[PDB]
Design a protein around this ligand. Structure first.
Ligand SMILES: *[C@@H]1O[C@H](CO)[C@@H](O)[C@H](O)[C@H]1NC(C)=O
Lengths: 45, 29
């Protein structure tokens, strides 16, 4: 339980990139792979 | 959080883990 161990000085810091931003990065990479292929990694899509 | 003493002296405080209702303000996760 998080609120049984947090009372001893332990604190869980939230990550910088949330799940939504990681999902957006994943969707962008998938769209670039499907539409462009390998061109969006070297230069323009 | 400070932009650096070389450019400004303004600072911002962040209380990591509270709801900021027992102490501009912007409630974050
Ligand atoms: C935190 O603040 C929000 C917004 O004012 C309030 O809705 C909520 O009840 C507060 N929660 C705690 C744990 O104080």
């Amino acid at each position: 339980l998080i609120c049984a161990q947090k009372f001893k000085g332990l604190t869980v810091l939230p990550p910088l990139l949330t799940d939504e931003m990681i999902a957006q990065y994943t969707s962008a990479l998938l769209a670039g792979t499907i539409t462009s292929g390998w061109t969006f990694g070297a230069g323009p899509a | 959080i400070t932009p650096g003493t070389n450019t400004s002296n303004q600072v911002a405080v962040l209380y990591q883990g509270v709801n900021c209702t027992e102490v501009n303000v912007f409630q974050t996760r």
